[PDB]
Amino acid sequence: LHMIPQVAHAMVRAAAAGRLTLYTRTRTETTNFDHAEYVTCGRYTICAFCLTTLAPHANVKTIQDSHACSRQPNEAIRSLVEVSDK
Amino acid sequence: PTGKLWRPVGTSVATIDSLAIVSDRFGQYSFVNEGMRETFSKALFDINMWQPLFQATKTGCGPIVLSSFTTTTSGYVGATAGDALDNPVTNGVFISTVQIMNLQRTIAARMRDVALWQKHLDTAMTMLTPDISAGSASCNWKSLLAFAKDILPLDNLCLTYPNEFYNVAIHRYPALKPGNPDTKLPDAQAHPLGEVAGAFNAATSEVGSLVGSSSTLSQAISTMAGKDLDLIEADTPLPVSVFTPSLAPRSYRPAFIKPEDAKWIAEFNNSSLIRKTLTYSGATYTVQLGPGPTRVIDMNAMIDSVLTLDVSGTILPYDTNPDLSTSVPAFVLIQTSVPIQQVTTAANITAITVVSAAGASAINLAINVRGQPRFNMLHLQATFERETITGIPYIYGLGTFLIPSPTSSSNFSNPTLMDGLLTVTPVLLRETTYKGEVVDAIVPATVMANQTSEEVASALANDAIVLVSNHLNKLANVVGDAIPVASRTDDSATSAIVSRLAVQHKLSQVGQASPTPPDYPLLWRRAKRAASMFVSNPSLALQVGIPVLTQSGMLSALTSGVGTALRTGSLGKGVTDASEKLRARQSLTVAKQAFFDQIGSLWP
Amino acid sequence: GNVQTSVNTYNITGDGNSFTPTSDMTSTAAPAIDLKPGVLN
Numbered sequence: 001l002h003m004i005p006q007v008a009h010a011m012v013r014a015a016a017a018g019r020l021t022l023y024t025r026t027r028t029e030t031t032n033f034d035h036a037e038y039v040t041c042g043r044y045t046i047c048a049f050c051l052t053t054l055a056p057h058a059n060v061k062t063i064q065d066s067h068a069c070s071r072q073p074n075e076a077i078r079s080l081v082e083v084s085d086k
Numbered sequence: 087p088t089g090k091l092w093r094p095v096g097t098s099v100a101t102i103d104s105l106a107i108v109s110d111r112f113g114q115y116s117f118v119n120e121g122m123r124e125t126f127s128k129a130l131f132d133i134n135m136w137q138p139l140f141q142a143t144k145t146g147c148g149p150i151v152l153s154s155f156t157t158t159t160s161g162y163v164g165a166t167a168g169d170a171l172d173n174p175v176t177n178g179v180f181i182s183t184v185q186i187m188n189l190q191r192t193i194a195a196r197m198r199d200v201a202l203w204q205k206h207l208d209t210a211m212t213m214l215t216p217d218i219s220a221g222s223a224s225c226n227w228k229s230l231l232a233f234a235k236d237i238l239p240l241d242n243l244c245l246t247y248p249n250e251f252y253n254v255a256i257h258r259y260p261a262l263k264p265g266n267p268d269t270k271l272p273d274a275q276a277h278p279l280g281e282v283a284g285a286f287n288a289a290t291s292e293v294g295s296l297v298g299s300s301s302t303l304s305q306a307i308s309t310m311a312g313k314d315l316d317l318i319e320a321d322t323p324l325p326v327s328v329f330t331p332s333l334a335p336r337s338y339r340p341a342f343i344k345p346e347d348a349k350w351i352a353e354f355n356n357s358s359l360i361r362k363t364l365t366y367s368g369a370t371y372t373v374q375l376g377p378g379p380t381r382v383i384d385m386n387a388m389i390d391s392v393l394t395l396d397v398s399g400t401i402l403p404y405d406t407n408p409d410l411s412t413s414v415p416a417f418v419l420i421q422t423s424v425p426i427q428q429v430t431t432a433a434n435i436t437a438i439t440v441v442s443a444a445g446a447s448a449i450n451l452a453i454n455v456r457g458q459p460r461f462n463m464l465h466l467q468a469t470f471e472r473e474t475i476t477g478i479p480y481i482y483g484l485g486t487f488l489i490p491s492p493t494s495s496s497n498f499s500n501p502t503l504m505d506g507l508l509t510v511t512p513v514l515l516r517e518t519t520y521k522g523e524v525v526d527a528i529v530p531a532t533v534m535a536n537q538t539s540e541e542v543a544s545a546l547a548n549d550a551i552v553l554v555s556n557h558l559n560k561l562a563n564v565v566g567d568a569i570p571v572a573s574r575t576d577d578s579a580t581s582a583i584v585s586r587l588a589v590q591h592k593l594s595q596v597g598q599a600s601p602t603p604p605d606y607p608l609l610w611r612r613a614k615r616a617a618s619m620f621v622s623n624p625s626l627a628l629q630v631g632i633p634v635l636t637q638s639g640m641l642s643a644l645t646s647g648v649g650t651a652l653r654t655g656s657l658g659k660g661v662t663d664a665s666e667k668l669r670a671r672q673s674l675t676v677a678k679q680a681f682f683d684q685i686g687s688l689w690p
Numbered sequence: 691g692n693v694q695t696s697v698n699t700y701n702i703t704g705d706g707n708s709f710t711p712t713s714d715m716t717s718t719a720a721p722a723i724d725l726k727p728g729v730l731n
């Protein structure tokens with residue numbers, strides 16, 4: 001029960017009125033999901049690789065983490081943002 | 087002597103090197119000094135007591151004599167060859183390691199055995215308060231027994247062994263006096279194994295209770311030396327450590343705290359509004375800094391803590407200005423170029439970071455509670471760190487709103503969510519904060535009568551004030567507890583202060599007509615309420631404008647009095663109001679005698 | 691309360707027993723035995 005599903009209820013509600021800033025490993029925001037690791041609302045922050053909650057403050061410039069992979073997809077929330085960004 | 091026993095390994099001549107811990111197949115014999123036998127005897131004594139229940143239930147294995155775990159070796163016994171050389175002991179009584187093991191696991195195994203029975207004996211014993219504290223009071227035995235024959239639930243152990251528990255009991259309750267076999271009558275005196283101890287716990291009518299009054303003193307003495315109540319108003323740098331600040335996370339309500347009432351919180355007092363923008367998660371929001379002054383947590387003077395601004399139950403008027411709804415509330419830092427309180431318009435605000443936004447706009451976080459939609463209890467929360475703000479002269483934490491589109495409706499709103507109950511928790515005790523600066527040492531005396539009414543209640547969790555308050559608070563419970571600062575007894579506390587008022591009012595009279603000879607009946611009484619007002623609300627001694635209490639003498643004075651006062655209480659300190667206290671105990675025994683009278687009738 | 695006889699020097703239902711608290715002898719075994727490191731040795 002790592003995920004804490006009150007967090008995931010904040011993921012989807014930030015997806016619908018898309019906010020969902022996608023941040024890379026060099027703490028810059030992109031919209032492509034390929035170079036991006038951190039996922040915000042901006043309440044909660046989750047690295048897309050390990051898929052764990054990191055900080056409730058977003059502004060991911062102040063987060064320490066050590067993970068490295070090439071997976072955690074659902075891209076579906078990422079896809080739902082750009083549709084709802086219009 | 088003490089420690090393990092040693093013996094001349096080189097034989098005969100025992101020098102500071104021809105020794106060696108006499109170890110062997112049993113482990114090392116450690117000496118059993120006089121007092122350490124008191125314990126193991128006192129422990130075994132409390133087990134032997136349960137002898138009648140060990141045989142009854144075929145457990146146990148005979149009485150445990152401490153003389154079965156020891157030996158009678160002889161040699162030099164110390165902590166090290168060097169010092170063991172000065173303790174030649176002959177035929178001392180040592181207990182070998184492997185033995186120090188059994189006397190241990192035996193007292194442990196037996197301790198379980200009895201701990202159990204001893205629990206059954208109790209639910210039955212205390213189940214008829216065999217303890218009064220004034221005069222006597224009987225309860226005809228027949229009834230008593232025929233009564234518990236009932237109450238006691240079918241799974242006790244006092245029903246399976248009545249006079250197998252009774253014999254254990256007689257030695258613990260000098261209430262139950264067994265009827266002597268050859269005169270078939272009681273004994274007047276009751277002889278329970280705890281003969282002395284039980285004699286010295288009775289609430290002696292002369293003075294409350296020696297066992298009580300004695301401890302309430304040694305207890306206070308502990309604190310007095312411990313925390314460091316002594317030196318409470320010392321005038322010189324003291325490491326925060328000296329204040330053992332722990333479990334210390336205070337919560338507020340900013341956006342209310344005046345900036346001058348607490349340095350760690352400045353405000354944007356500017357004419358118009360200061361709508362700024364910032365791309366947060368793609369979407370562009372506008373921080374407002376609305377109509378009012380919008381008090382914001384300053385970042386400097388903010389001991390790297392864990393700021394957790396809770397926004398709940400607080401109003402959320404998205405009903406009127408629709409502008410408010412849609413905006414995700416979020417705690418955001420704000421770096422300004424020109425110092426705040428001088429920051430006029432948007433071009434002044436360097437940048438704005440959303441350190442922690444709330445997913446989902448202001449229309450899901452709501453909840454209607456009679457028209458006025460409130461905020462569903464949620465906690466936004468940064469983790470400010472001393473150095474993440476290095477260089478940056480101006481930066482402020484602000485729990486604002488982040489409106490997705492400013493409008494005319496939100497022209498008098500001012501979205502500061504600071505009205506919420508923010509809870510800062512210093513996450514790095516070593517560093518404190520004072521008057522707006524971060525330090526590593528306080529100067530106690532400085533913080534006395536230096537805060538204002540609310541320059542105290544507005545203190546920042548683990549800051550000098552909150553530390554020079556946590557401290558007085560201990561010293562406040564030592565007096566409140568041990569010393570009698572709550573009766574007309576002009577105690578040692580209110581007495582230390584009176585001597586200061588005199589010496590003080592006496593020199594202020596020196597030079598000039600001296601038309602007023604010091605009072606004293608009025609001084610004693612003035613200092614009595616001064617020492618009393620302190621015990622009452624320890625805090626006050628920090629607020630500017632408190633009679634007596636805030637002069638440099640007092641406190642520094644008080645404590646050092648209260649100090650020596652505890653180190654002399656005697657034992658019979660309980661003599662204070664030991665009259666009404668006594669008369670109240672007789673009052674209880676008269677009512678409890680009334681109880682035994684029914685146990686005595688109902689169950690004849 | 692059935693008669694026993696020798697197991698223990700006193701019968702419970704024995705002749706002339708007597709429950710009777712006296713403010714004078716507060717019943718107490720040995721709970722506060724000191725064992726802390728410094729104090730036990």
Ligand SMILES: *C(=O)CCCCCCCCCCCCC
Nearest residue numbers: 234235244248251252255691692
């Ligand atoms: C026979 O066992 C009848 C019941 C009488 C005594 C049972 C236990 C209640 C009285 C306790 C006596 C020992 C200490 C309470």
